[PDB]
Design a protein around this ligand. Sequence first.
Ligand SMILES: NC(=O)c1ccc[n+]([C@@H]2O[C@H](COP(=O)([O-])OP(=O)(O)OC[C@H]3O[C@@H](n4cnc5c(N)ncnc54)[C@H](OP(=O)(O)O)[C@@H]3O)[C@@H](O)[C@H]2O)c1
Ligand SMILES: NC(=O)c1ccc[n+]([C@@H]2O[C@H](COP(=O)([O-])OP(=O)(O)OC[C@H]3O[C@@H](n4cnc5c(N)ncnc54)[C@H](OP(=O)(O)O)[C@@H]3O)[C@@H](O)[C@H]2O)c1
Ligand SMILES: NC(=O)c1ccc[n+]([C@@H]2O[C@H](COP(=O)([O-])OP(=O)(O)OC[C@H]3O[C@@H](n4cnc5c(N)ncnc54)[C@H](OP(=O)(O)O)[C@@H]3O)[C@@H](O)[C@H]2O)c1
Lengths: 279, 1243, 70, 69
Amino acid sequence: QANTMDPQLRMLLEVTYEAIVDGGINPASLRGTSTGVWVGVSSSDASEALSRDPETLVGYSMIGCQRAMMANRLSFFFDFKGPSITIDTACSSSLLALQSAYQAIRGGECSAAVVGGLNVLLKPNSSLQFMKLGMLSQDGTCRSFDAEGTGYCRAEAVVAVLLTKKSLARRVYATILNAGTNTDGSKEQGVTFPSGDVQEQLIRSLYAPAGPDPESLEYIEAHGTGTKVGDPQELNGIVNALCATRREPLLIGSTKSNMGHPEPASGVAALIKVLLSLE
Amino acid sequence: SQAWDVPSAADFPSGSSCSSVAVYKFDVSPESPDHYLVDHCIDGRVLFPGTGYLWLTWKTLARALSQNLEETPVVFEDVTLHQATILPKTGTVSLEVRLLEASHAFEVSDSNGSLIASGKVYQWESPDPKLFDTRAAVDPADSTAEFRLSQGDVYKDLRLRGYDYGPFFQLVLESDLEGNRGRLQWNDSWVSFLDAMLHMSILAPGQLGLYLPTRFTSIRIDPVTHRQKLYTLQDTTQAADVVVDRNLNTVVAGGALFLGAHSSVAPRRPQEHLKPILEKFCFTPHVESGCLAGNTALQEELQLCRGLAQALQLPRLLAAACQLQLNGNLGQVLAQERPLLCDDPLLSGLLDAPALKACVDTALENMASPKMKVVEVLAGDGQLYSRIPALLNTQPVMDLDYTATDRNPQALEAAQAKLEQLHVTQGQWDPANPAPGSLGKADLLVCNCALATLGDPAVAVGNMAATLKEGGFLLLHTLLAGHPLGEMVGFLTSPEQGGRHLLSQDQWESLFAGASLHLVALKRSFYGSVLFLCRQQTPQDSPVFLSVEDTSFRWVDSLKDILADASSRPVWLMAVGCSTSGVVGMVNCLRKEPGGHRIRCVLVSNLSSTSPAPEMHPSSSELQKVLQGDLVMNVYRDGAWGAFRHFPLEQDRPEKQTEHAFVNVLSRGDLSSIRWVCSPLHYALPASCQDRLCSVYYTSLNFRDVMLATGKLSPDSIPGKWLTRDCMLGMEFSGRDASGRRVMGMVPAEGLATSVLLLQHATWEVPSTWTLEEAASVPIVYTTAYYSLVVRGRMQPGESVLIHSGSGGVGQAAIAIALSRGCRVFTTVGSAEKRAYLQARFPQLDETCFANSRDTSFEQHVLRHTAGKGVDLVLNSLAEEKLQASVRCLAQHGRFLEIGKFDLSNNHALGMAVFLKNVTFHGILLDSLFEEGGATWQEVSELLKAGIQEGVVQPLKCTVFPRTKVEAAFRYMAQGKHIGKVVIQVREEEQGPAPRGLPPIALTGLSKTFCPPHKSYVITGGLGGFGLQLAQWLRLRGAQKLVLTSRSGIRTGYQARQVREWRRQGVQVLVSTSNASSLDGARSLITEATQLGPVGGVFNLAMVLRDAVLENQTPEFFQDVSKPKYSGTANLDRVTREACPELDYFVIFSSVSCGRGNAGQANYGFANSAMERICEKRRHDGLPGLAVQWGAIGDVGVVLETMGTNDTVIGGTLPQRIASCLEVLDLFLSQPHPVLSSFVLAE
Amino acid sequence: NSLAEEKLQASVRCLAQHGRFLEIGKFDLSNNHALGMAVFLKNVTFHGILLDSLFEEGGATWQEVSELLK
Amino acid sequence: ETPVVFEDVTLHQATILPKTGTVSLEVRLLEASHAFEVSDSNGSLIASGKVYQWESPDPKLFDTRAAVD
Ligand SMILES: NC(=O)c1ccc[n+]([C@@H]2O[C@H](COP(=O)([O-])OP(=O)(O)OC[C@H]3O[C@@H](n4cnc5c(N)ncnc54)[C@H](OP(=O)(O)O)[C@@H]3O)[C@@H](O)[C@H]2O)c1
Ligand SMILES: NC(=O)c1ccc[n+]([C@@H]2O[C@H](COP(=O)([O-])OP(=O)(O)OC[C@H]3O[C@@H](n4cnc5c(N)ncnc54)[C@H](OP(=O)(O)O)[C@@H]3O)[C@@H](O)[C@H]2O)c1
Ligand SMILES: NC(=O)c1ccc[n+]([C@@H]2O[C@H](COP(=O)([O-])OP(=O)(O)OC[C@H]3O[C@@H](n4cnc5c(N)ncnc54)[C@H](OP(=O)(O)O)[C@@H]3O)[C@@H](O)[C@H]2O)c1
């Protein structure tokens, strides 16, 4: 039943144990909580793989590949009786999972969360599509910001962080001040087009009048894909929302230039770059 | 630790929808569903089942059809398997099956792209169940009588041949004796059932050798009728009836019907991780003097170092450290003995020949348990650590603690590379007494003293004496100064003023008498090297003395009583009467049977071999000489005290002085494996055939001789009924017949020979004007030509002919003959130089006559100067595309003469539409005439007889080799570097003035036992597993008169058939119930065999077992076991002498149970050791005598019928696959020695 | 043989050693159907046959065939 | 870039293209046997032979010389 397990789910089961114990907790001390699990997953390539040979391929592959099982089977093992959920929003996902989670703790529902980001590259077709849309860099790099940006360079990652109410955390990497998501309306220039005029808005909803001070920001970690369109549209809207303020306001960077674009894992894989560098 | 399944790049859709292709990935490891496959073990590999590919392909077809396997009754046609697939112990192999849905064709690729199997498949629309009838020849009222073959019986005959089928594949339950009927067991696996049908096909009576499938013509499976045709045994299992109709070539079983399922030969590949350990069992004295003196190498050195060094009184030390000191001509003198100081294990300095093993041995059975702690002081220079781990690892019952201790850490440095694999405990040690904890007391201590001599005599020995363990052993080796070299070692490497520090024999004698020792052994060399074994004795107790001379076996309940005696330290067994009292074997059993383990079970034996050898008395002087020595094993032959030891055999393939020999290959495809085998005429020339003898001056190779000595062509496509697919080379020769006449002739094979048996319908008188050379080139060549052109292609004069390869043998002749009746010739030829030879040799050739031969260009060329009409006959001997192109040169009414065999052999396609040119296509095989010499052959002979007298036929260019370079004669012919014939010469011809010579041919010929067809051979227990094989093997090596003995008679089907068949092959076989343990019985037997013909062979294979440890043994469990072996052997010895004046072979199977012993076979042991005496008597009397101590015997022994596999580890050994036994026995038979061992090593 | 496909092939298999196939038929011939060359190890000889190839080409061979009739 | 060799090619029926509409020819390859086949929509056999990449493309085979002016 393990050779029919999507390698994501395999190493998710590990990284989230590695994460729960990372912060001084014994996973067992959670057994039976109102604790939830939120997984950002875009591609479950492994599932199709073990679903083509109709004499060869077995029935319990789906208990090890169906997307929901990415969260469900993580709840199943740790005995986490609160929400179990996988979200697909594409490149964002894991970050909107880590949002969806934060809210659920904040609001009483839970006392702790497993937030996961998953994305493993198996089927070459996938990539081929992405190239036929020209969002892939022949270069094969994520030149962030730089003018030498064609497209991004897809990378994989299984990553997990454990959220908790402070009155229960033995370790604190950082504290979540705010989060929210919106969605580019109907842009006249296609669905792939990143609408900065709408990303600005999102960044506002969370700061000045209904959030922290745009002046407190030391570092904003961009998306920083490396699109000849994406990069400007984003960075523009960024300054157009965080910058009536002196000193070199926000130093900026993007893990994605170090490692590639983990797509739905990006957000959380990004957060990890951030927490790491803080420590 | 454990790694898991990562969906793979190619696992995802990479083309599109395709109902017509399937990749199957087979995993064979013990977990997989497809583990069953590991039971298809052929010759020891796990081949994926011929049958298997059809099962895939079938599966693959129902895929494309959306239907399952049980609804798609299939039809195969013209299926052809090309290579089989070897499944690796672990990992995954992939077979891909592709379907052509309109052409009905199909193909099976592998991962690597190779072709595996091709044919045509399709749904079978009108499945006619009447095609699967099971109706007999009549009503058999023969249940309860009959004689069938039992599942066991069947796979016995197969596994014999090379088919190591495993359980999940042993599906043949029962079989008719001829293998035309029977019952196959259902498995719910087509791959098995299908391959079982193949079994039955392969399972002919008297068909030997290893056969894989290769073509089917038409398989037809209909799973509906199949479910029906099936039944259920009482077993609760499932089976159906199989039937084979060899006259129609069809196997049917349940719902699967084969047609034309042609299988074919495969080469057995000798896995040399199963080469047998061959040992000779000579008697060895403890008192050996003047040893060696048989090495031409060691005597060319007591004079090359007593000749440059005798002026002061090449390769190795005393030659290199003594010569490089006269080259510079004491300080740098110890600097020219050290670039060659490890050049010190020198042949002379070191005595590693037989002596070393003879004493290590003595020491080794003198401990209860076959485990031995060994230690070696002065280990660096005197490297005994190289030899004794090897001498010991030789025995099947061993456990070794080797410990190499040296004064410095330095000297054990070059040994880190060497000691790590022999597994040797190391440490530090200087012969000054102190025996560390790092020694903890041993069993044997060894020491090379032709070394940096210890410095001290009895101080070095006071340590070696303080590491004994009760009464262990000491082996030491000093160079003695009572010789020309003994004092010449002392002077050299140790510059010391007392460098002459190496005492003499008497001086070492009392250096041991001091530590309380006893010289157990002594090996005095001729050059001065001497070997000392030493054992130091802890007091003896109450020495019980039991004589074992009786025939009763009373002593049995007396040794069963001496197992009540507590620590009876000395319990000595001793024959005094019978010189055939196999105690030596007995002992070896008890000496490690729990009860007498530490019993110090000793033996004493009287084996005088000639009459004037009296000298054996107890109670007196010698009894105590031997009790003092204490040695476990004490034998006495005509003067010397020494045990019976095992030594390695002299290896060299026994040759013989002959006037007859034929050359054979020893390994299909490796030309180095060519030698001169003994001709069977060297064994007997019976008046009958004798008036046909012929001595060969020249034998000539032909192409077939090569393609076989290579292996491009299977001994399959050779016409004729063949006793032995073995000997098969040479068919042309020239010499003088028994008349004295002067002849050239052909011969179906075995032509490469000093002598040959004249085929009278195919031998001609060679004219006065032809040398014997020139004559020896003609026969094949021309006949093949005349047969092709004239008889078969009915060539008429003034036609056009395309002869390929004009340079060739057949070529030159072809041309000569076409040119004689004046045809337009067109020849092909590879060399620019061959264009030359030909243009010369035949003047009537234009430049228009020549085209190439390494290429298809010849077609275009023939089509030009033929005005697009083509040639009237083609003599094609070329391959694939070139043959096809040769077909296209055919003009209307033309005739293709296919001399070639490759394209033919592989069932290549021929474009039928060529037959509209009213063309006729001639397959041609001269070997199909010849022996079978009919009318047609005569017609072809007188075409030669005539063409000769009309000068049409002329000798070719002869590139002649000496009878030594037979090998190169082949490789030279290999690489097409020849014009005309290649001829191997055997006798320089007899010159000018008419000589009537009479040749003195001495020749170097390897021995191969053959049976004169007039002598009769006797094997007792001839119906027993092995005997049946010995009989088989006998008939093969020639025997015509067998006498097989058994107490009951023919009782198994598997016997019933072997004997029934041998009778059909013309062998005179006689099953006898005469028992040889009674003298009257023996004479009855020999007289029986004599009515068949003088007796030439006597093999004693009979044996009854009585397994039981010594406390279960009764004095008649003992007498029963020896009656067939000792009593039988003895009687047959007597009777044989009294009246068998033509006996050549007297053979007797012993066992290693007599050698190293087996717990619970104390009786078996005795009986067997007994025979080894009687055989030694005979050898000593100059009579044939051979006892073989076999190890575990596989393929058919008492083993395969009792226990189980050829994988069973018995007595620390493995089953010798009978095949190997026979070829070992073959070696043994032509040996001097009386006793020889043979067993395989376990782990 | 004057028969077709599978029947021709099956007719080939009735050949004994040294046997001779007389192919009078024309269908299998005409479509360049495959012939299993391995049949020629039986030292068999295969005869394509067209009487129309002599008929007006009235040569020696035709005469031979006529006096077999005569 | 794939200079090819056909062998023993054989066309069985030809295909009639209708004034309008679409016809389908399917080509199947046997990569080890070098064989090939051409089916049609209806399953029928259209053309069969052997094809393969031509390793040593000998341009001298395309000689348009001739010494008859
Ligand atoms: N059916 C029968 O009864 C029968 C009887 C005799 C012989 N045969 C067959 O007829 C053939 C000719 O026999 P033979 O003894 O007359 O000829 P041969 O002198 O023994 O040599 C065979 C010829 O093949 C040509 N050849 C092409 N490539 C070659 C290569 N790579 N290695 C060796 N030779 C090569 C050589 O001529 P080029 O170099 O000029 O091409 C050579 O002259 C043989 O293949 C044999 O099997 C059949
Ligand atoms: N197999 C091994 O592993 C192995 C190892 C070492 C040595 N050997 C040698 O193998 C020989 C036989 O063993 P095997 O397994 O090959 O065959 P086997 O079948 O066990 O041979 C024994 C047969 O000999 C016959 N026999 C017994 N006493 C006889 C007598 N007094 N007179 C005439 N025939 C008698 C019996 O035939 P009936 O059916 O009439 O009773 C019996 O079936 C022995 O001599 C032994 O030295 C075998
Ligand atoms: N190549 C030459 O030079 C040459 C010359 C003359 C004739 N031929 C050939 O020889 C063959 C016989 O010619 P023929 O003049 O003797 O003709 P025929 O015998 O008078 O009639 C043809 C025979 O073919 C058999 N046949 C098998 N299946 C048949 C079917 N489905 N329908 C009709 N008949 C069938 C019939 O015998 P059954 O009812 O017993 O099956 C019939 O007797 C012909 O096929 C022709 O091509 C060749």
